[PDB]
Structure formats: structure tokens, C-alpha cells
Amino acid sequence: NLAPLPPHVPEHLVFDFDMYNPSNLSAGVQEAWAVLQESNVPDLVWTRCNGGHWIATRGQLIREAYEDYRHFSSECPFIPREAGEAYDFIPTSMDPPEQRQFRALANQVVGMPVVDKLENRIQELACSLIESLRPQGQCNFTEDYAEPFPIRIFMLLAGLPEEDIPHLKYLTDQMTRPDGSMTFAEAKEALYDYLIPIIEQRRQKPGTDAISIVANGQVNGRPITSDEAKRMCGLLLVGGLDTVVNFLSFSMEFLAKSPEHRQELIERPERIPAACEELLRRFSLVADGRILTSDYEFHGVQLKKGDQILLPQMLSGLDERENACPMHVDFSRQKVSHTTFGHGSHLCLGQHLARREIIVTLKEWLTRIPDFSIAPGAQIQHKSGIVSGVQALPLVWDPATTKAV
């Protein structure tokens, strides 16, 4: 369904891409988005889908817009417009300058020092899940590892019970890839309904878990409000339950289909962190954006105050103007250019946690289960939205080829 083209938008820039159901999805989601980078497509296009909005299709523009918070505000960062208007997570819904005091606080809960401290438990969980899978010779990777490994770590960090995962995972998914049963506003309202009593309890009686730290925290030296703490804890929940979970499935799908790549990593384990970075480029998965604060001419195009612009973080590293042969995975790639974790003042705060989870997964899996493949006949389906993912990933292996550590 197509919104009527606004008078200010030139007809020759129309390209009706649907970020929640892209045409070429059956080829793979990164592939489907990469159609925006085919020869005759301009650097900045307008789609009439999802209410109508701009899309920057090249890393140069994506980077520029993410740096210019004066013209490109994060106040309304999701498409469609009702989702972006409801969106109020902190720090993402704020621009500098007042954004920055809240980042600092979020860094006490997910920053490098905290990840270094979680390192042992992250390792232990990865090993326990993989060892229990190893003799079975099969798994449903999405449900049996990609979801439990990073989600159980987040719930440990937040001091939330694991049996709450199904509900919270359902809500987080309606915000990024809605099935249509809930609007963004309704899912948000439900996540905040979950958090409100836990935030009150933990202000009254502080523990050492992430929610306690945020809810009793200070920002530029003044106490955080209950409403602020809720808006920050909601975003940490979303990052914990719907980023790495999806990324692991893209990576393992790739490794299942590419023995020569696993072989490289089995033979040279020291290459694993570099391989992590190249898979973060090739299987980049996030796309949000910004709202115009004023009329503004950008790259020869007249943008109007209030227009939304999708700035897909996924696309910068896929752009052949940033990386030659961008669809090829090369663990030896000399200059891995990407914006997978965003760009500008909102650069991902969870990226150190995410890289630790990914590198630990690769090392631990490859040590125990070096040889695996996709279940025969399985037609692996991706799904697209603010964060893209893999619907199911059935894997099989011969337990005879595995290795107990």
C-alpha cells in the first residue's frame, strides 16, 4: 500500500522499497536491501511504502546524515511515523547535547569494564549449551542457541527471571518486526508495564544488577527520574533481546554453507576476531533513521521539515564505494569499512558485549562442532524490519566428528 507522493518529492526519485517486506527477500535480506545499490538507483530515493519516507542508499550519505544531528534528529527514529512518534527510549530518542549524560550512565551497565567482568559467565554459558548439543547431531539454531545464549546473559545482567523471556521477546519483536498483532505504541506500553514495578522495587531496595544501577543512577550529577530510568531500561532490554540473537543466526547460516571459511578458522583461530568484524560488515542487520528538523537541501534534493529519512546502517558496508566485492566474505579484508553499530553520537553502547558474545560463540562452537551443515531440504527464510533476522536455522552434523573439550 502506497501513500500518495508529496508535492515536494520528485517523481524520478521514487523507488517503492518496503523495509518490512522487501521484494527480493527470498534471496537473503542483505541481498534484498542491496537492490537499493543497483546501477540506476540514486543516492537518495523516496519510497511510498510505510507512509512514505526517504532512504539514503550509500555509505557517504548515511554517514553524513548520522553526523549532522542539527538537520537529522533522532526524536522520531523509526518508520512508520506512528512508531517513530511513540518511540521515546533513552538515549536514542535524544539529540546532543542532552543525550550525552544519559549515555554515560548506560555505559556503567554495558561498557567495556562490565563486559570484562561477564567474560567468565559468557564463556561458561556458551560451553554448556554447545556441549549439550554436541552429541545430538542436530539443532534448531535460532531456538537452541542464538536466542538463549545472549538473552540469558542479558537477563543475568538485568537480574530478571528467565521464565519472563517469552513474553519480553514477543514484545521486543513487535517493535522491530511486527506480526501485526501489536502496534509499536502497544508493545512499548507493555514493556513499560513490565518494568514500572521492578524499577520502583529496585529504587527502594537497590541490588547490583543493571536495572538497579540505572534506576539509582545520576546524570551529570543529578538523580535520574523513574520515567527516565524506565525509558533507558526499555532500550537496554531491546538491545539485549533482539540484536546479537539475530546476528548469530546470519553468521552461523554462513558458516554452515561455507566449509572453507570454517576451515580457515579451525586452522587459524587467531583470525577469529577479524572474522567477527568481516561478518558484522557482511551480515549487518539494523536500519533506523531520523526526522528532518527544517527544510534542507541535501545532495541536490529538497528535504522538508518533518520528512522521515531511513539511514540504513546495514548498507554502508555493503556499498561497493566502501568495500570492493562487498558481498564476498574475506576474513583477510584489509580495511573493513562499515556502520554496523551505527555512526555519530549514537554509536552502539552494547558493541563490546556484542563482539564478546560473537567471538566466544565462534571459538567455542568451532572447537566442539567444526563440521556442520544446514538440514537437507531446508529453505532458510529471512525476515526484515528495523532489525533483520533468520526465521529458523536447522543444523545437522555427525556426532562422530565432534570434539569434547
Ligand code: HEM
Ligand atoms: C550485533 C549486535 C548489535 C548491533 C548491530 C547494534 C546496533 C546498534 C545501532 C545501529 C545503534 C544506533 C541506532 C541509532 O543511531 O539510532 C545502536 C545503539 C545502541 N545500542 Fe546497539 N547493537 C547491537 C547490540 C547491542 C547490545 C547487546 C546492547 C545492550 C544490551 C545494545 C545497546 C545499545 C544502546 C543502549 C544504544 C543507544 C545509544 C545511543 O542512542 O546513544 N546494543 N546499536
Ligand SMILES: CC1(C)[C@@H]2CC[C@@]1(C)C(=O)C2
Ligand atoms: C536500532 C537499535 C538496534 C538500537 C538498539 C536497539 C534498537 C532496536 C534501537 O531502538 C536503538
Ligand SMILES: [K+]
Ligand atoms: K518520538
